Every structure is written in C-alpha cells, then in structure tokens.
Amino acid sequence: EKYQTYYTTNEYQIVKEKLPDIIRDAEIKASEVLEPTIYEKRAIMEVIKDFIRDHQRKVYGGTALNEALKQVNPKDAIYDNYSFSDIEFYSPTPVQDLVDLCNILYRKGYKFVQGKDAQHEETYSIFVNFQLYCDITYSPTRVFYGIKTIEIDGINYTDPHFMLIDYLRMVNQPLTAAGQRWEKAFERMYRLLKDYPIEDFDKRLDIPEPPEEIQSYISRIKTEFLSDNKLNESFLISGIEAYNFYIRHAASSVNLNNFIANVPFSELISVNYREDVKNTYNFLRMIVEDKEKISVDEYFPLFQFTGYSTVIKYDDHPIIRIYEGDGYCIPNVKTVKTVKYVSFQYVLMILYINKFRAHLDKNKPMYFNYGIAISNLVKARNIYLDQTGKSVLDNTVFKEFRTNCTGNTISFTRMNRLRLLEKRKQGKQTSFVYTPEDFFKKDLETQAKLDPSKARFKNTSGNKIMVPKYLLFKIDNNGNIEDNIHSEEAEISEK
Amino acid sequence: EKYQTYYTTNEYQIVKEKLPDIIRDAEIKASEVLEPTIYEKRAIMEVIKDFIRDHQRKVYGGTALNEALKQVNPKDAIYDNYSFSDIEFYSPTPVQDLVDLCNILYRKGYKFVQGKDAQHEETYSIFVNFQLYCDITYSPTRVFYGIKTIEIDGINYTDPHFMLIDYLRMVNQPLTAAGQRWEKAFERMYRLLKDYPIEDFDKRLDIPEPPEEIQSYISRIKTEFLSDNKLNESFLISGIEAYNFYIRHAASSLNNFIANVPFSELISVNYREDVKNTYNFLRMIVEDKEKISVDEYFPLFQFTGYSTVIKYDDHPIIRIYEGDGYCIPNVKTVKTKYEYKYVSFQYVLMILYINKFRAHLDKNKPMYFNYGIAISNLVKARNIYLDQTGKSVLDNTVFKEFRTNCTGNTISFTRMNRLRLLEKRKQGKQTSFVYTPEDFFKKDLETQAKLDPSKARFKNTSGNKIMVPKYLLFKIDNNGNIEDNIHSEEAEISE
Incomplete structure (x- = not known):
C-alpha cells in the first residue's frame, strides 16, 4: 500500500501566497472577454449616473462612500475599476424611476433589462444582462428633502455623516448583522471617519x-x-x-x-x-x-x-x-x-x-x-x-x-420571508417585475394598465x-x- | 473649523486583529438564540441523515469531504466547530426523494417545509422554516451505482478520489470559476490529497x-x-x-x-x-x-x-x-x-x-x-x-x-444557468417546481393524485x-x- 504526496511543504504555502493575485489576474481577463464586460459595465453605470443627475436623486451605499473618499484621497477608495458595484439611491417616486430607467436602458439597446421588487426594505432592483447594476430605495417626501447631500459631478451623494448612521446601524445589530457586515462596515467606518472626521x-x-x-x-x-x-x-x-x-x-x-x-x-x-x-x-x-x-x-x-x-x-x-x-x-x-x-x-x-x-x-x-x-x-x-x-x-x-x-x-432573512408571507396572505403583491422588452411586445391597452403612481409604501x-x-x-x-x-x-x- | 479623530494608529489595527474572533463569538451567540437554532438545525439534519441512510443515497461535497477528512483526522475537517453546512446528495429518483423527505419533515411537525427546483445541475432544494437544509442532485442509474463510496454510520459518502474530479473540474474552468471557487477548491484539494493521497x-x-x-x-x-x-x-x-x-x-x-x-x-x-x-x-x-x-x-x-x-x-x-x-x-x-x-x-x-x-x-x-x-x-x-x-x-x-x-x-455559470432556464421556459419544460406539503395536504385527494414524481424528465x-x-x-x-x-x-x- 504505497502512496505519493501531491502538494508539499512549502508548496502549499507558495500556492496560498500567489493564489488571490492569480484569481485577480483571471477576473481581469474574465471582465475583458465575458459578457457583460467591464466596458458594458461602465456604459450602463454612466447611463444610470446620468438619470440620477437628471431627476436629482440621492446616492447612498458603497458608491457614495467610494466617490466621497476619493474626493478627499483617491487612495482611500473602497472600489477598483473592476468592481461590478451596485449604485443605490433614494427616491420619493421609486417605481416610476424604475420604469423610466428601465425604459431608457432598453431603448439604449441593452437586454435583458429588468426591474424587480428586491427582498430588502421598499427597495427595487435594476438588472441588465443578468447583472445587478442599481437599487432604488423609497424615501418619504419629508425624509428625502431633509437628507444633507454633498455634490460631485452634479450628483447628490448622501452626506458622509448621514451614511455613518447606517454603518453604526450595522454594528448596533450584533445578532443579525455581525457575520455578513461587521468586517466591511468597520473598514468603511474607519476611512469615512478618517476623510470626513467628526x-x-x-x-x-x-x-x-x-x-x-x-x-x-x-x-x-x-x-x-x-x-x-x-x-x-x-x-x-x-x-x-x-x-x-x-x-x-x-x-x-481639561475640561x-x-x-x-x-x-x-x-x-x-x-x-x-x-x-x-x-x-x-x-x-x-x-x-x-x-x-x-x-x-x-x-x-x-x-x-x-x-x-x-x-x-x-x-x-x-x-x-x-x-x-x-x-x-x-x-x-x-x-x-x-x-443600598x-x-x-x-x-x-x-x-x-x-x-x-x-x-x-x-x-x-x-x-x-x-x-x-x-x-x-x-x-x-x-x-x-x-x-x-x-x-x-x-x-x-x-x-x-x-x-x-x-x-x-x-430575528435574522434579516426571517424578517424578510415572514413580512413577505404576511403581505402574501393579504394579497398586497409579492414580487413586481418589469421587462421593457416583453412589455413593449404587448398592445397599448395592456401598456395603459401599468401605473407606478398606484404603489403603496409604509x-x-x-x-x-x-x-x-x-x-x-x-x-x-x-x-x-x-x-x-x-x-x-x-x-x-x-408624492 | 477644528475636527476630532475617531480611531487612530494603531487603534485601527487593534480592531482588524480581534474583529474576526469577535464576529465568530457573535455568530456563536446568534446560533444559540435565533430560530431556527442549532437545536432545530441538528433535528432537521438528523431527520434527513436518517432518510439518506434508509434509501442509501450518496452524499457529496462539503458535508462528505468533512466526514471523510474526519474519519482520518477530525482536526483536518473543513466545516469547523458546528459551522452550519448544506446537505448535498446524489439520487436516481430525486423528485420522488424530494416529495418523501418533504412529507416526512412536514408530518414530523415542522413548517415551512418546501421543496424547490434549485435551478442548477438537475438539483432540487429542501427548505424548512426559511432555511435551506439540503440539495438532491440527479445521477443516472448507470453512473449512480458506479460511484465508489466510503461508509460512515450507514451513510454512503462519495469517494475522496472521485470528489477530486469535481475539484479539478473547478481549477480547469479559469474564466468562469477562478474568483468564486479557486480559493476553497485549492484549500480542499490540499487537505483531500493529504488525508487521501494519490x-x-x-x-x-x-x-x-x-x-x-x-x-x-x-x-x-x-x-x-x-x-x-x-x-x-x-x-x-x-x-x-x-x-x-x-x-x-x-x-x-x-x-x-x-x-x-x-x-x-x-x-x-x-x-x-x-x-x-x-x-x-x-x-x-x-x-x-x-x-x-x-x-x-x-x-x-x-x-x-x-x-x-x-x-x-x-x-x-x-x-x-x-x-x-x-x-x-x-x-x-x-x-x-x-x-x-x-x-x-x-x-x-x-x-x-x-x-x-x-x-x-x-x-x-x-x-x-x-x-x-x-x-x-x-x-x-x-x-x-x-x-x-x-x-x-x-x-x-x-x-x-x-x-x-x-x-x-x-460563458459565466450565471449566464449558462439563466439562458438554459429561458430556453426551457420558451419550450414550456417547466421553470421552477415547488412542493409545499402543508398547502398540498389542504387540497382534495383528486388534486393530490395529479402529482407524479415518476413523470419527470432529465438530460x-x-x-x-x-x-x-x-x-x-x-x-x-x-x-x-x-x-x-x-x-x-x-x-x-x-x-
């Protein structure tokens, strides 16, 4: 019963070392030849960035932070130009925005442009060619205009000291958000509080x-x-x-x-x-x-x-x-x-x-x-x-x-699946989908049935x-x- | 104007160091108090492990490699100190197995017991109380019984030298699988080829x-x-x-x-x-x-x-x-x-x-x-x-x-998956298959008779x-x- 040793010491170490670099070098190649490519990526992003500028919506999440950290110091960027990063933004008319951005992108040529109702809190999603590009989040009128903003390239980026709320909101949920968020939220909190101090x-x-x-x-x-x-x-x-x-x-x-x-x-x-x-x-x-x-x-x-x-x-x-x-x-x-x-x-x-x-x-x-x-x-x-x-x-x-x-x-997943099941029993409409390609293959009578103004929010x-x-x-x-x-x-x- | 510095040097380092340990310590707390807890997990897990033993199915992947690594060293195991893993097993009658395990679990008291079409490599999914527990994969009769197995506790765990094929299959897809798989697949390939050498x-x-x-x-x-x-x-x-x-x-x-x-x-x-x-x-x-x-x-x-x-x-x-x-x-x-x-x-x-x-x-x-x-x-x-x-x-x-x-x-896996689904969707070969025993048993014996898992087609x-x-x-x-x-x-x- 003789055996051979595949991988040794320090051959195992040697691999672990260069492995993430090789994986990176490979992801680079994949992004330049596999559809959607890094250019298709850049293209859709600039189309959406133009829409946000037009309707003057408020960008939050990774995108705002990256943009802001970069205005201070480009080295403090949380993203590479290889990042397929979600561009999230606040809007008082989110389902109408969804239909507009979905139409604009379809007309621009792309496929498969789809507007889904996301799992998360009164958020909607835009996917283009099986790739999530952005998320539109419902912000009530009152809240929306009260959000302090910072301007970069005519886009309203949610104030760093406001985004901070959401980062603390993560560290302040130890049982439901420690695994999935505490590593990125700490890293981001650090750079935010470095480039935008208190x-x-x-x-x-x-x-x-x-x-x-x-x-x-x-x-x-x-x-x-x-x-x-x-x-x-x-x-x-x-x-x-x-x-x-x-x-x-x-x-x-003192003092x-x-x-x-x-x-x-x-x-x-x-x-x-x-x-x-x-x-x-x-x-x-x-x-x-x-x-x-x-x-x-x-x-x-x-x-x-x-x-x-x-x-x-x-x-x-x-x-x-x-x-x-x-x-x-x-x-x-x-x-x-x-006592x-x-x-x-x-x-x-x-x-x-x-x-x-x-x-x-x-x-x-x-x-x-x-x-x-x-x-x-x-x-x-x-x-x-x-x-x-x-x-x-x-x-x-x-x-x-x-x-x-x-x-x-209760874990987010539990909170999401239970809420969905409650409104599912109520018939308050589970998942909303918009596929402009499929919608425009339909008659003007059916096209008239779709109304984003008739959407309810908490x-x-x-x-x-x-x-x-x-x-x-x-x-x-x-x-x-x-x-x-x-x-x-x-x-x-x-409104 | 005059700012304060929250987090410094080496305060930032101090955090990054203990942070994954703290995240672990928190996941431990989360696992001992959030429904479904390990006192619900291990219950469902042992019910499924009993079914696999009964029908003598072949367990593969992480669960399988884990137990095999364990039978040679429990220190060289992949899933750690009860880190929640997914059950994945091969079966020639997977949709019938799905309906059996879904019935067994429902009858045992649990909710929400659901059997979904996983949308992969002719794989099906079992969820119980909004938690994925196992995956059943279709293996043709010929292939199935030819798979060399290793026995542990009356369960057929896929031979390490056979699972190895799937790990090489990962490193042999550089454009579609380098990012998402090459890190785990190398680590696992190492520990497999050391506990089960060539x-x-x-x-x-x-x-x-x-x-x-x-x-x-x-x-x-x-x-x-x-x-x-x-x-x-x-x-x-x-x-x-x-x-x-x-x-x-x-x-x-x-x-x-x-x-x-x-x-x-x-x-x-x-x-x-x-x-x-x-x-x-x-x-x-x-x-x-x-x-x-x-x-x-x-x-x-x-x-x-x-x-x-x-x-x-x-x-x-x-x-x-x-x-x-x-x-x-x-x-x-x-x-x-x-x-x-x-x-x-x-x-x-x-x-x-x-x-x-x-x-x-x-x-x-x-x-x-x-x-x-x-x-x-x-x-x-x-x-x-x-x-x-x-x-x-x-x-x-x-x-x-x-x-x-x-x-x-x-073409990327996601692309291959979404396109295959859309092709069979146009064919009307049925997109997503769902089984909710609670809902199925609220229905009459006439409708209950309509469901036949024997009448399911596979490549x-x-x-x-x-x-x-x-x-x-x-x-x-x-x-x-x-x-x-x-x-x-x-x-x-x-x-």
Whole structure:
C-alpha cells in the first residue's frame, strides 16, 4: 500500500501566497472577454449616473462612500475599476424611476433589462444582462428633502455623516448583522471617519431645564418605575440620560464634567413597547397631580432609523418619549445599583438620528444640541482612553462591537420571508417585475394598465399620528389607555 | 473649523486583529438564540441523515469531504466547530426523494417545509422554516451505482478520489470559476490529497499496440490534418498522446512511463464541424472507405460532453470529445506543421480519472487498471521534474497549475444557468417546481393524485453508446458521407 504526496511543504504555502493575485489576474481577463464586460459595465453605470443627475436623486451605499473618499484621497477608495458595484439611491417616486430607467436602458439597446421588487426594505432592483447594476430605495417626501447631500459631478451623494448612521446601524445589530457586515462596515467606518472626521465644537450645551413638577416625574420614573424588577425588564435608557451616563464615566481616570446636560425628558427604548407604554401611562396617571393634564402624542417610525414612538405629556410638557425596539436585540451596558443603558456606539448613533429628527421637525436649538452632544461624547471617550491607556475592545463602558444585547431578535432573512408571507396572505403583491422588452411586445391597452403612481409604501415619515385609525393606543372615557384595534396602513407613491 | 479623530494608529489595527474572533463569538451567540437554532438545525439534519441512510443515497461535497477528512483526522475537517453546512446528495429518483423527505419533515411537525427546483445541475432544494437544509442532485442509474463510496454510520459518502474530479473540474474552468471557487477548491484539494493521497503503482502500462495501418491512420491525423492551420483551431490533444507529452517533458536534462497510443483522444471547442471534418479527412486518407464506422456516446454524467469514435475495421482511430461552451486551459506547441494544442497538466490528470471511471462503467477492467497506472506515473513524473529543477506548480513550466490561458468561447455559470432556464421556459419544460406539503395536504385527494414524481424528465448523461438514430447527433447518407442529424433532445424519465 504505497502512496505519493501531491502538494508539499512549502508548496502549499507558495500556492496560498500567489493564489488571490492569480484569481485577480483571471477576473481581469474574465471582465475583458465575458459578457457583460467591464466596458458594458461602465456604459450602463454612466447611463444610470446620468438619470440620477437628471431627476436629482440621492446616492447612498458603497458608491457614495467610494466617490466621497476619493474626493478627499483617491487612495482611500473602497472600489477598483473592476468592481461590478451596485449604485443605490433614494427616491420619493421609486417605481416610476424604475420604469423610466428601465425604459431608457432598453431603448439604449441593452437586454435583458429588468426591474424587480428586491427582498430588502421598499427597495427595487435594476438588472441588465443578468447583472445587478442599481437599487432604488423609497424615501418619504419629508425624509428625502431633509437628507444633507454633498455634490460631485452634479450628483447628490448622501452626506458622509448621514451614511455613518447606517454603518453604526450595522454594528448596533450584533445578532443579525455581525457575520455578513461587521468586517466591511468597520473598514468603511474607519476611512469615512478618517476623510470626513467628526467635528470639534467648543460651543456649550444649551438644553433648557424644565419645571420642578416635570423635573420630579422624569426622576421618579427612574427611581420608582424603572427600579421595579417586574416592570424594567424591556427598558433601555437612551437620550441625554444615557448621554450623561457616558459623560460621567469619562471623569474616572481639561475640561471637567462641563459636558453634563439638563435632561429635558426621558427617552427610552422598549423591546416590548405596547405593554411598557401602557405601564408608563398608568404609572404617571397614579404619580401625577391631576390626571386630566396627561396627554399622549404618537409618532410614525422615522424612516428606517427608529420604530414607532410615544410621548407622554403632562400640561403639554414631555416627561418621557418611548421608542419601539420590538424585534431588535439592543447592545447595552450593565452597572446596576445599590443600598440598562444603550451601548456607547448606540448613543453615538441615536444622537445623529435625533439631530436628523430635529432637522425635519425644523427645531434648530435641538439640531444644534445633538451636534454639540456628539462632539462632547466623542471628546469624552477619547480623553478616557488616553488617561487609561485602554482600547475600544477592552471591557470598559465605551466598549465597541458588543455582542451582549437585550431583546428577542430575528435574522434579516426571517424578517424578510415572514413580512413577505404576511403581505402574501393579504394579497398586497409579492414580487413586481418589469421587462421593457416583453412589455413593449404587448398592445397599448395592456401598456395603459401599468401605473407606478398606484404603489403603496409604509408611512415612515417620523410625523405625529393625527387620525385615530392610525394611532396604536386608545384613551377610553374613564381616562385609561388601551390597545387600538385599527388599520396599520401607510401611503401612496402620489408624492 | 477644528475636527476630532475617531480611531487612530494603531487603534485601527487593534480592531482588524480581534474583529474576526469577535464576529465568530457573535455568530456563536446568534446560533444559540435565533430560530431556527442549532437545536432545530441538528433535528432537521438528523431527520434527513436518517432518510439518506434508509434509501442509501450518496452524499457529496462539503458535508462528505468533512466526514471523510474526519474519519482520518477530525482536526483536518473543513466545516469547523458546528459551522452550519448544506446537505448535498446524489439520487436516481430525486423528485420522488424530494416529495418523501418533504412529507416526512412536514408530518414530523415542522413548517415551512418546501421543496424547490434549485435551478442548477438537475438539483432540487429542501427548505424548512426559511432555511435551506439540503440539495438532491440527479445521477443516472448507470453512473449512480458506479460511484465508489466510503461508509460512515450507514451513510454512503462519495469517494475522496472521485470528489477530486469535481475539484479539478473547478481549477480547469479559469474564466468562469477562478474568483468564486479557486480559493476553497485549492484549500480542499490540499487537505483531500493529504488525508487521501494519490496511490503509488510500480506496475507497467499494458496498453495494446494497434495495427501498422491503424497507427498509420492515427499518425497522418497529426501530420496531414492537425497541421492545417484552417482545421486545427478548435482541437486540443487529450488522452495517452497528451499523457505521453507530459511523460516526455518530465525527462528533459528511464523514460519507461511511455505508453502505446491506442487511438487519438481529442477535445473540440467546435465539435460538430471538427467531427465531420475528421470523418471526411479519414474517408480520403483511408484504403477502402466502407470499413469506416461511427460510434456516438452520450455525455458521461457531468464530467464530459458528447463523444464520437471514428473506427476503421471496428478499430478506434480517434475519439472526439465535445468541449463546446468551455475554455480549456492548454499548452500550445510549434513544430517548425506549427501549432499543436495539448490540454493542461491538471486537465490530463483530470481526464485520466474520468476515463478510469468510464472504464469502470463500461466494465472494461484492463483500461480501468491502465488509467490508474497512468495517473500514478504522471504524478511520479511531475514530482521528479520539479525535484530535479527546484521549480514550483506556479512557475512557467509545462506542469504549471492554475492556468488562465485557455482555448474556446466560454460563458459565466450565471449566464449558462439563466439562458438554459429561458430556453426551457420558451419550450414550456417547466421553470421552477415547488412542493409545499402543508398547502398540498389542504387540497382534495383528486388534486393530490395529479402529482407524479415518476413523470419527470432529465438530460441523458449515462456515458452510453447512442443506439437509436433519433438520439444520434450525426447521420451517414447513402453516398457514404456524414451529416448533422435533425433529431430530438435526449430527455430520459426519472422512473
């Protein structure tokens, strides 16, 4: 039983070394002779880049980042001219844009030009000759025009400090996005925060201190409500409260506690919202001097950055704003006294999100405060690690890439396949396809049947829910709170 | 204006270092809490592993290589410390197996149990609770039982020296498979060829020397036919001719590895034209043309295309293989009459194994032993050459591996898949087949009776001589000449 040895030492090493270079050298050859070639690629991309310029849409994802990193330093590019990179962009009329770009590309000669309804969140896809070229994402009117942009070659590239939200959004989903995203999202976050650094503001935090009646209720929610172990299970401390937490923890070892801010109201995230809101309401309705002063404001999700929210107000004063974290496992910090705070990268995330809410809400003082808060929170973390000689991975309060989280989460695939099956049972139309070649082989009567204006999307405006049939909660005549048996409807593509 | 620096030197490095470990530590957490969890995975996996044992199917790929590597070393295993893998197995009745395993799993309680048409190499898919668990691949009866297996826990795992064919099949497709496969296929080829090395045979090559007339008809194909620059464009020299080429080249400053060439084995990247042309040349160069006979053969599973043997007095002169749609890595030579293309070193090492398997199916025991000797000798030859020259598998030698230089118009897998699907879509041969037992069992016994998995057609990939003329690619007209047969597609039934 004699045997031969194919591959040895260091022959195996020799192969592993040159192998990715050879694979590259081969992909180069493949791109210059296999259809679609690198030139067909370049051609379609410039056709789409022209359309974005024309309708003035907002480009995000890899394409915006690459373009932006390059405006600063071409060496900091995340793409090669061999990259078959997806050009993603935001649009308030996405299905109409899909039909236009699909027509334009078909007319230009290409095949097989196809416009599909993608798996992901209110995104549509354009494929040309079995190759995905771009993705059109629905952005509600309100959100859309509020997005800060940077201009390059007459194209609106989503502000680097806005794209940053989405990158933190990745690191802030440890169970559903650690494998598939944390490697690229860290690498990209690095270059983005290198070429577009976080600003340094010497300006003071000017958050108005509220009245004593309110000031006591905000405090008594922490001391009396959030202490009850059968009540605080699903709560996570966000807002200026959480901000101050990291601000205080930065003192533990030019220019002191001076970064501390007046807490204007509580901002909490619940991983069991409907139960936790009703419970906060009933607690305030018990601890409040004249219960008929209590009012409840609800808000739609802010784009794709938050879920629903509810503000409980006493004399039109916000006491607490509760956010819906249902379906998410939020990375959190543990201390817990004596005789749950959202993670450092989560607060750094919400601060940016809240700054954007302010911008949409037209609120200029809050828009300036969040910006100050971010700068201060970053100054705070840096000086702490400088004084302690620590790292973003050492078990500190400012630790990054946390796996430890609160809440029952579900993988993207699961979330996508379940949502699809729900709307499939509803008959809200599963997959939408547009093949201009096939569409134009059809009569003008059938061609007339297609209307992109008649397309519905989830209301993700961040706007106060006015109409009661869209409100999640109901206030009964006795003054109590109840789960509203409503219609979870949203909005048409008619702008 | 004055900015802050988030992430520095060597803070960026620090992150890149621990990051894949953290991602791993996170995937561990995700695997212990996200439905379906490993406590649902291993349940479904063991149900399928039981079915494979029952019907005695042949497991291949990653799962198979893993367990085989494991039976010799569990440290040299490919899938790591319960890294979720895909079940892939061969079956002569795959659609019936799909319906059985889909029923069994549904009855066992699970949802959503679904059996899809995978859209590949006559492969079918089983998903349970939005998670792909296994893939069933169609293997014709003839091929199926000829596959040498290794038994572990009453399950038939595909012989490592057979799986090797598929791994070489990957490195032998440089334009369509270099990016997506050459990294894993090399790593796996290494660990397979170390835990299951290539045998060492001291036995002599006993290939019978053919008649002086037959050898004369063979030689004149090389001189008078393959020299003509308007004829030899699509030809590639395979078989013992190519084998001998690498045997002679290993001995360049007892040359006993040389073999009698029993006949020419050629691969054409323009087969129908190149076959008719060989036939017509031989019909002119031959003494009495009525002694010329033509034997055709179906593709041998997924290892070859169609073949044609041109025989003079029932003696094989030349066997031509169909390489249409493939870009074969080669080594061009120039006798200066000039151009001669030999199939790459790893391509001959590949066909030798494929030919040894053909012999096994053809029951031919002397050829089954000769190919085995040839492989051993060809490997002995390459090793001793690199030992004498101090060279590597990547240096520009005749025995160079991972070649990019190839002959023939190829098309990317995606293109081949989407075009094949569109061709059968126009034919109405059914695009995507779905089985949802939950939905199927909500239906009446009359509709339930309509579903028959025995009535499923597959491409005839037996490697068998084409007997019936309506399945023959060529026709011999009364005048004695060759013609393209205007026949029907060879779709054998599952039964």
